[PDB]
C-alpha cells in the first residue's frame, strides 16, 4: 500500500540494514517510504 | 551499496541503477567514463568481440579458434605450475640478442626470434 | 654500605622538605587529593552495586539506549527499484527462472 | 580443498576489501596517532650528549650561538650542549578521521608470484603491484614468455604506456621526509619516485622492447588516458602490441592530504551513522558524502586485431573509441566538468 | 584457466557476417587481449 | 612510409619533403656533460 | 586572445600536452615535509603537486577548450615525448591546435 | 634545587597528582554508568 | 656530471592547414617524432 | 636606453646563467648548511613548557610514559614535561 | 664503590 513506515531494529547491522532494503526494493509501491532506525524498547529513554 | 538512489538521479531517464546483478542475453557495447583532478575527463567505448570476427570468413575465424584453444592449454599449464612453484612471474636475465648482434637487430626491421634447443627464444646470430 | 649512605638520603630528604617549605608547596598535596577522590569513588560503586544487585546483568544490558537519528536509514527510491524489478523479471522469463505457472510472476507484476 | 572454505573463508573476507587500516601493511601507519613535529624553543640549557667530531660540527653549524661543543681530550669525541634559545623538534600525535581504506588483501606479496628478492628490495611497492600485474596480464593474453611477441613483431613495436597520478609515493616520502630525518635510506630513491620508473622496470625485467613509452599523469583518470595513448600510438604505426593501465598506492601523507581537500569520507562520522567499513562507499546513494581511498593497479595488454588473430590470442573486446577532454575556464581544480 | 568464450560462428557471428565482412581494416582496429589487476579484492578473477 | 620494412621512419619523414639524410644539417644533442650520455648520443646519431 | 582559436576551430580541438619529470616540487615538499613539521601550509597543496595541474591551470586561465589533455612523464625527455604525444594526437583528429 | 634532590632520591614529586588524575578518570566511567540507571528509572524508583 | 637548472619551454603546434588558414607564423615542420625503450637491464638511469 | 647597457649589463650577467645558488630564490636554501634532523634520546627530564589543552594531549598521546601533562587550574592551560627516555629531534647542518 | 659515589658527583655537578 502507499504506506510510509518507521521500522525499529535492536540489532542494527549492515545485514539488517540490507534486509530492509531488500524488502523496500520489492514491496515499495509508489508513495511508500521505509525508515529504519536502531532502537531498544527496553529503554525508557529510547522510547521517548 | 545502493542504499537508496538520490531523487536527483530520477531525471536521468536513460540511466537505470541496478542494486543487484542481472544476467542478460548479452551486452554489445559499453562505456567506461572517468574524471580526474584538474579537469581531466576521459571516456572509452568497448564493443563485443563477435563483431570483430564478423569481418572474417568462417574459414579464417575457425582457423584462429584452433590457435586460441592451443594457447589456453599452454596458459593453463603455466598458471598451475606457477601457483604451485611461485613462478607466475619470471624475470628475464638477458635480452634476446647477444650484445654482438644488438646494433644489427635494432636496425633490421625484419629480424625476429627463433625458438631454440632449450625451448628459449633468441635472435639468430 | 646502605647505612654509610642512609645518612645522605636522610640529610637530603630534610633538605628537600625545607625548600618545599620555603616555596610554600605541599608535596603530599597530590597524594592527599588522590586518597580523597578514591573515597568518593567508593560511595559511587556502592550505589552502583545496588542497581547491579537489584536488577542483574541481562537487564542491565537490556536497558541500554540504542536510538540514534544519525544511524537512521531512509529507503524511498521506488521509481528505480521498479525499472529494476521490471527489467529483472524480463530476463527471468527468458531463462525460465519464471514459468507462467509460478504464483511468483503474479506477485512481481503487482 | 573441501576444508579451505571453512578454515579460511571467514578470515579471507575479514582481511580483504574496504577495511580498517592495518598498520603492518603500511610500516606502522596508524591514523589514530598521526605523528607530527612541533618546534619548541628550549628555555634552558639542556644536558650534554656525546657525538662524533663530525656530528658535533654539524650541530654547531646549524645552531651557532646556541650550542657548545668541545673535544673529549681522551677519546677524540665531542660533547654537545644546546643552550637556551636553541630550537628543538618534539613529536606529537593526532587522531585522524580516515580510519578505513580499501587495501590489498592482508598477506599479498609479490614474492609469491616470483619477483626476485633483490628487485623486491630495490623498488617502490607500487612497482611491485605493476610488475605482478603485467605478468598476470600477459598470461591472460596467452603470452608465457614476452619474447614470443618477437616472433611476429620487431623489438620496436611492443609499447609501454602505463601511468599513474603520483606513483612512487614511498620513495617520495623517503626523500622529502625520511632523509631530512636522517633515517637509513637508499641512494637512488630518486629513481623509484618517477611515474615512468614503473614502466621502466617492466621493460627491464620482461619486454626488452625498443617500442614507445608514453607514460601519462591524468590523476584519477590516468588509466583511461593511458588506454587512449596506447590506442593512438598503435594506430599511428608506432607499435602493434602495447601494455596499458594505471596504478597508485595508499599512503599516510596522501590520505591526510585528501582529507584536507574534503574528497575522502570521514570514517569517524560515518561510524557515527551506523555505517560499516565497506557500507562506507555508496556511489549513487543519497547519503553519499565522500570517496574511499584504495590502492593497487590494473593493466590490459592491447594489439591490432590483425596481430591478435595472427598470433591467436584471446580477444576480450574492441577498443572502439577513446578520448580526453578538458572543461571550461574555472578556478576549482578538483571540480568535474 | 578460462580464456573468453569464443562465440559460435553460426548462432552468434554468421548473422552479421553479411554486412561486416571485410568492412574494417584489422590493422587499425585496437583490441584488448590481456586483463589483470591487483586490488583490495585480489586479482581480476577473485575481484569479479 | 608508415610501417614500410624498406623505409626507415627517418628516411620516410625526410623523403616526403624531398630530402635525404644528407640534407639533415644540424643535430641538437642532449649532451648533458655526463660521461656516458655523450658517448652514447654521438654513437646513436652516428650509427643512424 | 586564445579565443581566436575558436574562430577557426571547435572548443574540442585545442589540445593540452604539457608534461614534466616531477612537477610541483614545492607542493610536494609542503605535504611530505612542511606538514609533518606543522608549518603553515595550504589545504589544497595536494592539487598543485600533480604534473597535470600545471596543464589544468593553463586551461582554467586561458584556453577554455574541451580539447584533449595527454600529459607525459618521460623524465629528462618529457619535452620531446610531449611533442610526440601532441603530434600523434593531432594526426588522429583529436585536435588541430 | 628541589628537583635535582628529588632526582637523587629517586622520587617522582608529581606521582601523587598523576595517580589522582587517573582515579578521577575512572570515577567518570562510574558516574557514567550510574547516570544510566538514574535515567532509565527515576528517583522515586531508585529510592523504592 | 650534469648541471641542475630550472624553468620550462613551450611550443604551440597546429596542422599546416589550420596554420595557413589562420595566417600564423611557421617556425618549422615536425617531420617525425618517436619514443624508444632500450634492452633488458638493471640500471634505471642508464642511456641505451 | 643608451645608458641601460652601462648601468645594468654587469649585474644582469652576474645574476643570470649558471651561477652560485642564491638562497633568496629558494626560500633560504643554502647548500652550505643543508639542514637535517637527528633523533636524540633525552637522558634527563627537561623543563616544562606551557601548551593548549589540545596540544598537551597530542604530546602525551605520542609520548605516554615519557611525558607528564597537568592542568593549570587557573588558566585551563597545561604543562608539558618530557621525561628521560623521551625522543627529541635536534637540527644539524651539512656542507653540500 | 665509584657508583655509590657517582650519584653524588652527578648531584653536585647539577
Ligand atoms: N507468533 C505467535 O504465535 C504470537 C502469539 C501472541 C503474540 N505474538 C506477538 O507477536 C509479536 C511479534 O513477535 P513474533 O512472535 O512474531 O516474533 P519474535 O521472534 O518474538 O520477534 C521479536 C522481535 O522483537 C525485536 N526485539 C527483541 N528484543 C528487542 C528489544 N530489546 N528492543 C526492541 N526490539 C526488540 C527483534 O527485532 P530486531 O531483530 O530488529 O531487533 C525481534 O525480531 C510479539 O509482540 C508477540 O508477543 C505472537
E24 Cβ under 8 Å from any chain B Cβ: yes
- Considering only CA atoms, which of C54, C45, A40 is closest in space to residue H45? C54
Strands (E) located in C4-77: 73-75
Residue J92 to residue D249: CA distance in whole angstroms: 32
- The 10 Å Cβ neighbour count of residue D114 is 17
Give contacts of D274 with chain A, Cβ < 8 Å.
Answer: 12, 17, 38
The alpha carbon dihedral of H30, H33, H39, H44 has a sign of negative
Residue I19 to residue I29: CA distance in whole angstroms: 11
Cell representation of residue D259: 582529507
Helix (H), strand (E) at residue D298: strand D296-304
Please tell me the distance between residue A20's alpha carbon and the centre of ligand 1 in angstroms.
16
Cell representation of residue E6: 569464443
CB of G74 closer than 8 Å to CB of G20:
no
CB of G70 closer than 8 Å to CB of D193:
no
Q: How many CA atoms lie within 13 A of J1 on its CB side?
A: 0
Tell me the shortest Cα–Cα distance from A3 to chain B, in angstroms. 17
Residue F1 to residue F13: CA distance in whole angstroms: 8
Q: Which residues line the pocket of ligand 1, CB cutoff 6 A? A: A 9-11, 39-42; C 62
Residue C56 to residue G24: CA distance in whole angstroms: 64
Give contacts of D270 with chain C, Cβ < 8 Å.
Answer: none
CB of D273 closer than 8 Å to CB of D287:
yes
Instruction: Give me the residue label for grid cell 637548472.
Output: I5
The DSSP secondary-structure symbol of D66 reads G
Interior CA angle at D126 toward D128 and D135, to 5°? 40
E abuts K (3+ Cβ pairs < 8 Å): no
CA D203 to chain centroid, in Å, comes to 19
Buried b / exposed e over C26-37, threshold 16 CB at 10 Å, is ebeebeebbeeb
- Considering only CA atoms, which of G22, G2, G7, G19 is closest in space to residue G64? G2
Q: Pairing relation of β-strands D241-248 and D296-304? A: antiparallel
Residue D318, helix vs strand vs coil = strand
B3 Cβ under 8 Å from any chain A Cβ: yes
Residue D301 to residue J37: CA distance in whole angstroms: 46
Which of A7, A9, A10 to mutate to test ligand 1, by most ligand atoms within 8 A of the CB atom? A10
Q: Pairing relation of β-strands C73-75 and A33-38? A: antiparallel
Interior CA angle at B62 toward B57 and B63, to 5°? 100
Residue C56 to residue B95: CA distance in whole angstroms: 77
A46 Cβ under 8 Å from any chain C Cβ: yes
CB of B48 closer than 8 Å to CB of E6:
no
CB of D211 closer than 8 Å to CB of D155:
yes
Helix (H), strand (E) at residue G83: helix G78-90
Cβ separation E4–D315 shorter than 8 A: yes
Residue D337 to residue D328: CA distance in whole angstroms: 8
Residue D187 to residue D197: CA distance in whole angstroms: 16
Q: Pairing relation of β-strands D296-304 and E36-38? A: antiparallel
Residue D313 to residue E5: CA distance in whole angstroms: 12
Q: Pairing relation of β-strands J49-51 and E36-38? A: unpaired
Q: How many CA atoms lie within 13 A of G36 on its CB side?
A: 18
Buried b / exposed e over E23-48, threshold 16 CB at 10 Å, is eeebeebbbbbbbbbbbbbbbbeeee
CB of B39 closer than 8 Å to CB of G69:
yes
- The 10 Å Cβ neighbour count of residue D17 is 18
J10's CB contacts (< 8 A; 6+ apart) are none
Tell me the shortest Cα–Cα distance from I28 to chain G, in angstroms. 13
Cell representation of residue G2: 586564445
Interior CA angle at J54 toward J51 and J57, to 5°? 90
Phi-psi region of E22 (alpha: psi -120 to 50; beta: other; left: phi over 0): left
- The 10 Å Cβ neighbour count of residue G1 is 7
CB of G38 closer than 8 Å to CB of D294:
no
Nearest atom of ligand 1 to the alpha carbon of A42:
31
CB of C90 closer than 8 Å to CB of B26:
no
H abuts D (3+ Cβ pairs < 8 Å): no
Helix (H), strand (E) at residue D223: helix D222-234
Give contacts of D314 with chain E, Cβ < 8 Å.
Answer: 3-4, 33
Please tell me the distance between residue C103's alpha carbon and the centre of ligand 1 in angstroms.
29
Please tell me the distance between residue B20's alpha carbon and the centre of ligand 1 in angstroms.
30
Closest partner residue to G66 (CB to CB) among D163, D214, D327 is D327
Residue B38, helix vs strand vs coil = coil
Give contacts of D193 with chain G, Cβ < 8 Å.
Answer: 22
Nearest atom of ligand 1 to the alpha carbon of C62:
31
**End-to-end alpha-carbon separation of chain B, Å?**
60
Residue D293 to residue D291: CA distance in whole angstroms: 7
Residue J44, helix vs strand vs coil = coil
D171 Cβ under 8 Å from any chain J Cβ: no
Helix (H), strand (E) at residue D40: strand D34-41
Q: Pairing relation of β-strands A33-38 and A4-9? A: parallel
CB of A15 closer than 8 Å to CB of A44:
no
Interior CA angle at J25 toward J22 and J26, to 5°? 95
- φ and ψ at residue G48, rounded to 5 degrees: -70, 5
I42 Cβ under 8 Å from any chain B Cβ: no
Cell representation of residue F28: 641538437
F5 Cβ under 8 Å from any chain B Cβ: yes
- Considering only CA atoms, which of B41, D329, D325 is closest in space to residue G60? D329
CB of F3 closer than 8 Å to CB of E28:
no
Interior CA angle at D100 toward D98 and D104, to 5°? 130
Residue nearest to atom 27 of ligand 1 (CA): A10
Residue nearest to atom 37 of ligand 1 (CA): A9
CB of I42 closer than 8 Å to CB of D216:
no
A23's CB contacts (< 8 A; 6+ apart) are A34
- φ and ψ at residue G11, rounded to 5 degrees: -40, -35
- Report how many Cβ contacts below 8 Å link chain D to chain J: 82
- The 10 Å Cβ neighbour count of residue G33 is 21
Experimental method: X-ray
Cell representation of residue E2: 578460462
Helices D252-261 and G25-32: crossing angle in degrees, nearest 10, is 100
Give contacts of D313 with chain B, Cβ < 8 Å.
Answer: 68, 71
Helix (H), strand (E) at residue D323: strand D317-325
Name the closest residue on chain G to residue D180, using Cα atoms: G33
Amino acid at each position: 500500500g502507499g504506506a510510509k513506515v518507521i521500522v525499529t531494529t535492536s540489532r542494527f547491522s549492515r545485514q539488517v540494514t540490507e534486509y530492509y532494503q531488500g524488502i523496500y526494493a520489492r514491496c515499495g509501491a509508489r508513495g511508500s517510504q521505509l525508515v529504519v532506525v536502531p532502537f531498544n524498547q527496553g529503554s525508557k529513554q529510547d522510547v521517548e | 551499496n545502493a542504499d537508496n538512489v538520490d531523487k536527483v538521479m530520477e531525471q536521468f531517464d536513460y540511466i537505470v541503477y541496478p542494486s543487484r546483478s542481472i544476467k542478460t542475453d548479452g551486452i554489445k557495447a559499453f562505456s567506461v567514463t572517468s574524471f580526474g583532478f584538474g579537469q581531466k575527463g576521459a571516456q572509452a567505448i568497448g564493443v563485443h568481440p563477435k563483431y570483430l570476427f564478423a569481418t572474417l570468413d568462417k574459414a579464417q575465424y575457425e582457423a584462429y579458434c584452433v590457435k586460441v584453444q592451443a594457447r589456453q592449454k599452454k596458459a593453463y599449464r603455466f598458471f598451475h605450475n606457477g601457483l604451485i612453484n611461485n613462478k607466475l612471474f619470471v624475470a628475464k636475465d638477458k635480452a634476446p640478442y647477444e650484445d654482438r648482434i644488438q646494433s644489427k637487430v635494432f636496425l633490421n626491421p625484419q629480424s625476429r626470434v627463433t625458438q631454440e634447443s632449450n625451448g628459449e627464444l633468441k635472435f639468430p646470430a | 654500605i646502605d647505612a654509610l649512605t642512609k645518612d645522605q638520603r636522610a640529610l637530603f630528604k630534610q633538605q628537600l622538605e625545607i625548600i618545599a617549605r620555603y616555596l610554600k608547596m605541599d608535596l603530599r598535596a597530590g597524594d592527599k587529593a588522590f586518597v580523597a577522590s578514591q573515597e568518593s569513588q567508593k560511595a559511587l560503586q556502592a550505589q552502583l552495586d545496588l542497581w547491579q544487585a537489584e536488577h542483574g546483568d541481562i537487564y542491565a544490558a537490556g536497558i541500554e539506549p540504542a536510538f540514534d537519528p544519525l544511524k537512521a536509514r531512509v529507503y524511498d527510491s521506488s521509481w528505480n527499484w521498479a525499472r529494476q524489478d521490471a527489467l529483472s523479471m524480463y530476463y527471468d522469463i527468458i531463462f525460465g527462472r519464471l514459468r507462467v505457472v509460478d504464483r511468483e510472476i503474479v506477485s512481481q507484476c503487482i | 580443498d573441501k576444508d579451505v572454505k571453512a578454515k579460511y573463508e571467514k578470515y579471507i573476507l575479514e582481511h580483504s576489501g574496504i577495511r580498517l587500516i592495518e598498520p603492518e601493511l603500511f610500516g606502522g601507519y596508524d591514523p589514530n596517532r598521526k605523528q607530527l613535529l612541533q618546534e619548541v624553543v628550549i628555555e634552558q640549557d639542556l644536558e650534554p650528549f656525546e657525538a662524533s667530531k663530525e656530528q658535533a660540527e654539524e650541530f654547531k653549524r646549524e645552531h651557532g650561538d646556541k650550542v657548545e661543543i668541545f673535544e673529549i681530550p681522551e677519546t677524540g669525541q665531542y660533547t654537545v650542549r644546546l643552550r637556551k634559545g636553541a630550537t628543538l623538534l618534539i613529536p606529537k600525535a593526532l587522531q585522524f578521521d580516515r580510519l578505513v581504506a580499501g587495501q590489498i588483501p592482508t598477506g599479498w606479496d609479490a614474492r609469491r608470484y616470483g619477483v626476485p628478492e633483490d628487485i623486491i628490495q630495490q623498488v617502490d611497492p607500487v612497482t611491485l603491484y605493476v610488475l605482478v600485474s603485467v605478468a598476470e596480464a600477459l598470461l591472460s593474453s596467452g603470452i608465457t614468455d614476452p619474447y614470443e611477441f618477437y616472433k611476429y613483431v620487431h623489438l620496436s613495436e611492443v609499447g609501454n604506456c602505463i601511468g599513474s597520478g603520483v606513483g612512487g609515493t614511498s620513495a617520495l616520502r623517503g626523500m622529502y621526509k625520511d632523509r631530512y630525518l636522517d633515517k637509513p635510506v637508499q641512494k637512488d630513491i630518486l629513481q623509484e619516485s618517477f611515474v615512468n620508473t614503473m614502466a621502466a622496470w617492466v621493460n627491464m625485467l620482461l619486454l626488452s622492447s625498443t617500442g614507445p613509452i608514453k607514460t601519462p599523469v591524468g590523476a584519477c583518470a590516468t588509466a583511461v588516458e593511458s588506454l587512449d595513448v596506447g590506442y593512438d600510438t598503435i594506430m599511428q604505426g608506432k607499435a602493434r602490441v602495447c601494455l596499458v593501465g594505471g596504478f597508485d598506492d595508499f599512503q599516510e601523507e596522501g590520505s591526510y592530504e585528501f582529507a584536507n581537500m574534503g574528497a575522502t569520507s570521514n570514517a569517524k562520522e560515518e561510524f557515527a551513522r551506523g555505517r560499516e567499513p565497506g557500507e562506507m562507499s555508496r556511489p549513487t546513494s543519497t547519503t553519499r558524502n565522500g570517496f574511499m581511498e584504495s590502492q593497487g593497479c590494473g593493466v590490459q595488454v592491447i594489439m591490432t586485431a590483425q596481430l591478435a588473430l595472427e598470433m591467436g590470442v584471446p580477444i576480450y573486446g574492441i577498443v572502439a573509441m577513446t578520448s580526453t577532454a578538458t572543461d571550461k575556464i574555472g578556478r576549482s581544480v578538483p571540480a568535474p566538468g | 584457466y578460462p580464456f573468453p568464450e569464443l562465440p559460435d560462428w553460426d548462432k552468434d557471428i554468421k548473422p552479421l557476417n553479411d554486412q561486416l565482412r571485410g568492412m574494417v581494416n584489422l590493422d587499425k582496429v585496437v583490441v584488448v587481449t590481456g586483463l589483470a589487476e591487483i586490488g583490495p579484492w585480489g586479482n581480476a578473477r577473485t575481484r569479479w | 612510409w608508415r610501417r614500410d620494412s624498406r623505409i626507415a621512419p627517418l628516411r620516410g619523414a625526410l623523403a616526403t619533403w624531398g630530402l635525404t639524410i644528407d640534407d639533415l644539417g644540424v643535430a641538437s644533442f642532449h649532451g648533458t656533460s655526463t660521461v656516458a650520455n655523450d658517448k652514447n648520443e654521438s654513437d646513436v646519431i652516428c650509427q643512424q
